[PDB]
Design a protein around this ligand. Structure first.
Ligand SMILES: Nc1ncnc2c1ncn2[C@@H]1O[C@H](COP(=O)(O)OP(=O)(O)NP(=O)(O)O)[C@@H](O)[C@H]1O
Ligand SMILES: [Mg+2]
Ligand SMILES: [Mg+2]
Ligand SMILES: [Mg+2]
Length: 317
């Protein structure tokens, strides 16, 4: 049997979408799935981790990515989502740098790197209705993102003409994804990316790749609007159907390959007749879609079989 090893925190490895996909990959005649226990990931040296031929592994909070990297170097499995790229995915500066290099449209942006021992010495000038970062002017509305992609405290600053203040976004707390604040001035500690605010119809397009030639997309209310989460009768967040256009399918192809993440989530802002990438999240599954579960498992299994059947002498067309 070809062994597909799953290496992530238990919250992820035991999530419903993970279980739905793994039960389906297990239906492949020549594939066995082995899910690495969290206690092993955290407490055992990599030399003791289960063997696999193909490794599906991804960082989330508390995950020892250094160990996953060392395991992959030690065992040389076929890696579905590249591990070293997952250090870069944690840094919004590195994400935007890769997107730029790939000719991918993204919001006009500037990086404010602030020295925590000399915080007033960074390249920031502030007006009541704009900031100037490294000399570049961003008129309000503009967006302020922590350089850490794991920090979801993204702020939007409203122009005086709209009443000023700001919208403070955060990891969804039950019924809310943002709150209005009267504060009009930008944060004065930390490093940030400042970006132009892209006007959309008030929704985000969420894209989920499984290899570069498959991408499921759906839309959700932007947390940049009022911040009240829309929920249906079953209690799940409202999603809107999306079909990606030719340009966006190419964006998906580029993102997947550029970040070397077979399974890759990213966000699009449909603004001014184009689509702009504002976020790349790496490993991410769609929830509550039986067709996605089917498709994703089939694609991943086929990828595994295509790559490894020859060395295993398994017939595969
Ligand atoms: N430049 C922009 N213009 C307009 N809206 C933006 C812009 N940047 C981000 N937003 C909005 O703010 C939301 C959050 O920003 P995003 O860069 O996705 O942060 P995040 O913290 O990485 N969120 P997550 O998808 O959970 O990882 C986006 O989904 C958009 O609705
Ligand atoms: Mg099987
Ligand atoms: Mg996002
Ligand atoms: Mg993100």
């Amino acid at each position: 049997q070809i062994v597909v090893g799953i290496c992530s925190m238990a919250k992820k490895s035991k999530s419903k979408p993970m279980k739905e996909i793994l039960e389906r990959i297990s239906l492949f005649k020549y594939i066995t799935v082995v899910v690495f226990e969290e206690e092993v990931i955290l407490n055992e040296p990599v030399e003791n981790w289960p063997l696999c031929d193909c490794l599906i592994s991804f960082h989330s909070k508390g995950f020892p990515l250094d160990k996953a990297v060392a395991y992959a170097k030690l065992r040389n499995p076929f890696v579905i989502n590249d591990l070293n790229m997952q250090y870069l995915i944690q840094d919004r500066r590195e994400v935007y740098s890769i997107l730029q290099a790939e000719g991918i449209l993204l919001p006009r942006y500037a990086i404010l790197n602030r020295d925590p021992n000399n915080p007033k010495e960074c390249n920031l000038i502030e007006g009541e209705d704009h900031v100037e970062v490294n000399g570049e002017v961003f008129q309000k509305p503009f967006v302020e993102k922590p350089v850490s992609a794991e920090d979801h405290n993204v702020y939007i600053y409203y122009p005086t003409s709209a009443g000023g203040g700001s919208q403070r976004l955060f990891r969804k707390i039950g019924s809310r994804s943002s709150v209005y604040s009267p504060e009009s001035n930008v944060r004065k500690t930390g490093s940030y990316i400042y970006e132009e605010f892209m006007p959309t119809d008030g929704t985000d397009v969420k894209v989920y790749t499984v290899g570069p030639d498959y991408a499921h997309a759906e839309a959700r209310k932007s947390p940049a609007l009022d911040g009240k989460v829309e929920r249906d009768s079953e209690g799940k967040e409202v999603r809107y159907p999306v079909i990606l256009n030719a340009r966006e399918k190419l964006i998906a192809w580029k993102v997947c390959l550029a970040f070397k993440q077979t399974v890759c989530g990213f966000d699009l802002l449909r603004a001014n007749g184009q689509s702009y990438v504002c976020d790349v999240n790496g490993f991410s599954f769609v929830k509550n879609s039986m067709k996605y579960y089917d498709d994703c498992a089939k694609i991943l299994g086929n990828i595994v079989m295509r790559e490894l059947a020859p060395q295993f002498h398994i017939p595969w067309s």
